[PDB]
Amino acid sequence: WTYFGPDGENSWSKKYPSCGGLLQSPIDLHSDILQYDASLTPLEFQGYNLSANKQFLLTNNGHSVKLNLPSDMHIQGLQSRYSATQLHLHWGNPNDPHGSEHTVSGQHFAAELHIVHYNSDLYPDASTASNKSEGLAVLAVLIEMGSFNPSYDKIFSHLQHVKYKGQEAFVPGFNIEELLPERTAEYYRYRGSLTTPPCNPTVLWTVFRNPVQISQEQLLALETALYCTHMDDPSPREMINNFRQVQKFDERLVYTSFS
Amino acid sequence: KWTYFGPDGENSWSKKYPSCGGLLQSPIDLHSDILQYDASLTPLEFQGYNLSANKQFLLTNNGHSVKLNLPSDMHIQGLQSRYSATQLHLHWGNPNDPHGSEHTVSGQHFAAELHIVHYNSDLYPDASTASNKSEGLAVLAVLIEMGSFNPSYDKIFSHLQHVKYKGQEAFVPGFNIEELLPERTAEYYRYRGSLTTPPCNPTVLWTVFRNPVQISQEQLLALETALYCTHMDDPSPREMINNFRQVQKFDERLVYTSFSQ
Numbered sequence: 001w002t003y004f005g006p007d008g009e010n011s012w013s014k015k016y017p018s019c020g021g022l023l024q025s026p027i028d029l030h031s032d033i034l035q036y037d038a039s040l041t042p043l044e045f046q047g048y049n050l051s052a053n054k055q056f057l058l059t060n061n062g063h064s065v066k067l068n069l070p071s072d073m074h075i076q077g078l079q080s081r082y083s084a085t086q087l088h089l090h091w092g093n094p095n096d097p098h099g100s101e102h103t104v105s106g107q108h109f110a111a112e113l114h115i116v117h118y119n120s121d122l123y124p125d126a127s128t129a130s131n132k133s134e135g136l137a138v139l140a141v142l143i144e145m146g147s148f149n150p151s152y153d154k155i156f157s158h159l160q161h162v163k164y165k166g167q168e169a170f171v172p173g174f175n176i177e178e179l180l181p182e183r184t185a186e187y188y189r190y191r192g193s194l195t196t197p198p199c200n201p202t203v204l205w206t207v208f209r210n211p212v213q214i215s216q217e218q219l220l221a222l223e224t225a226l227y228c229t230h231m232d233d234p235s236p237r238e239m240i241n242n243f244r245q246v247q248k249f250d251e252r253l254v255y256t257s258f259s
Numbered sequence: 260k261w262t263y264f265g266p267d268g269e270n271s272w273s274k275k276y277p278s279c280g281g282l283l284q285s286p287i288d289l290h291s292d293i294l295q296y297d298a299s300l301t302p303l304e305f306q307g308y309n310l311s312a313n314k315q316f317l318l319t320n321n322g323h324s325v326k327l328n329l330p331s332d333m334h335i336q337g338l339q340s341r342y343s344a345t346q347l348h349l350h351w352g353n354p355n356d357p358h359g360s361e362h363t364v365s366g367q368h369f370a371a372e373l374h375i376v377h378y379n380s381d382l383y384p385d386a387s388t389a390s391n392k393s394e395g396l397a398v399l400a401v402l403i404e405m406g407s408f409n410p411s412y413d414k415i416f417s418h419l420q421h422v423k424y425k426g427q428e429a430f431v432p433g434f435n436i437e438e439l440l441p442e443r444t445a446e447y448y449r450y451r452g453s454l455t456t457p458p459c460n461p462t463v464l465w466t467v468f469r470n471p472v473q474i475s476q477e478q479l480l481a482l483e484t485a486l487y488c489t490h491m492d493d494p495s496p497r498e499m500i501n502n503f504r505q506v507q508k509f510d511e512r513l514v515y516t517s518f519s520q
């Protein structure tokens with residue numbers, strides 16, 4: 001599967017039936033579908049300050065760049081405890097640097113970070129959790145152009161060692177909480193899916209209301225570093241526009257922690 | 260069959276209609292990064308749009324939209340070939356989210372969208388043979404927003420409660436179709452794309468007018484609530500709502516504009 005051409009997103013449903021099933025993400029966050037829920041409590045991020053003496057595997061999986069995260073990282077504030085598994089990014093392209101997955105009032109942001117967690121009270125690991133009830137919880141951070149961000153540079157500075165699919169490098173531990181915005185207590189919450197194949201309708205989404213900033217140069221670096229193909233592919237393809245279009249969202253509601 | 264909701268909705272069109280997964284797909288979001296002014300883009304001329312009030316035209320609930328048949332003497336001039344009218348129809352949302360245009364502008368969905376469909380009659384016999392052939396189709400798009408009552412749109416809308424179910428027809432006396440067009444029709448977006456409905460043929464030259472028209476809250480609600488996708492006999496009716504396609508990726512391409520910004 002890809003994001004462009006014949007095996008692009010309108011064809012995902014052929015090999016991956018859930019990509020044309022229920023609860024699909026991402027969506028456009030707009031007033032007609034929002035409802036304040038005063039019961040939603042702020043999340044607490046535990047174990048996110050990773051030891052500088054430990055290291056963490058960065059991988060180009062052919063679709064994005066992922067960081068592996070340890071199952072001792074947890075979020076509190078959902079009904080079950082959810083432990084971390086990986087984080088990754090979605091982005092656009094230099095001529096159109098508007099590649100977030102979720103939109104707000106129809107507007108794309110430059111990019112989007114996802115911090116993926118699985119239900120560790122119910123399930124032993126992420127792979128088992130991925131296609132089961134209540135299995136996954138993703139945190140989403142919207143990214144715009146702004147000031148240089150030292151914390152996102154903790155990922156971006158390694159990008160030239162993972163240029164082709166399958167390549168790996170280690171990244172020393174850093175504080176994952178520095179990737180999060182201001183006032184995390186304000187967010188949108190809804191039931192949805194993976195935004196790539198296999199598109200399992202098994203995800204609890206929390207999209208923070210406030211965006212972070214990365215510089216133009218950091219954004220351009222991310223847009224131009226990577227390839228979807230293996231180092232010996234005779235038809236190389238750049239890793240750009242790796243985001244899904246927003247999905248229909250009807251007779252259903254997104255809940256907000258802010259009124 | 261195909262729908263806009265459930266197992267047969269738009270993510271699964273590609274399974275029965277392989278062009279829906281192919282190149283050049285519409286609709287799109289019209290936004291600054293992909294727009295460029297083209298000064299060679301001249302006004303279209305609308306000929307035979309003033310339909311005979313002594314003639315009647317067939318309006319049809321086809322299970323996916325409400326469609327008005329148009330005569331072959333109606334046409335657009337100004338493109339390389341003459342394109343002759345075949346039909347017009349609409350796309351809308353629903354009363355809880357009344358934002359069902361197909362094209363969007365700077366991420367803005369309008370309330371609804373009118374399409375006036377033409378075929379290249381210099382090169383081909385009729386619309387169905389023009390359909391899957393190169394530069395076979397041209398479509399005019401009007402973006403609709405909620406506001407003032409519109410007498411000309413009501414020439415169509417006043418029939419809606421008499422075509423509520425699939426297969427039903429009414430007769431509409433001729434009126435001036437140019438009166439469905441917005442102000443300053445010389446200002447438009449232009450690009451190569453596809454039919455927005457299966458079989459999604461990548462054969463459409465698009466013209467989307469810059470300026471929206473308005474219809475009243477009452478007219479928009481009648482459009483959103485009058486009609487069903489299913490036959491009159493159906494024990495389980497399905498409402499004809501949300502009959503618009505999501506915007507499509509549009510990468511390394513350009514939409515040209517006849518107005519400058």
Ligand SMILES: NS(=O)(=O)c1cccc(C(=O)CSc2ncccn2)c1
Pocket residue numbers: 085086114116126130138193194195196197198
């Ligand atoms: N963009 S996303 O966070 O919804 C996303 C898409 C696909 C996989 C993931 C994961 O974190 C791994 S869960 C998984 N991976 C492969 C196959 C099945 N599930 C996240």
Ligand SMILES: NS(=O)(=O)c1cccc(C(=O)CSc2ncccn2)c1
Pocket residue numbers: 345346374376386387390398453454455456457458
């Ligand atoms: N929404 S649209 O203007 O792009 C559109 C949708 C569906 C059909 C049509 C036509 O009538 C073109 S002729 C045709 N109709 C159905 C199938 C194939 N060709 C136009």
Ligand SMILES: [Zn+2]
Pocket residue numbers: 088089090114195
């Ligand atoms: Zn993701």
Ligand SMILES: [Zn+2]
Pocket residue numbers: 348349350374455
């Ligand atoms: Zn149409």
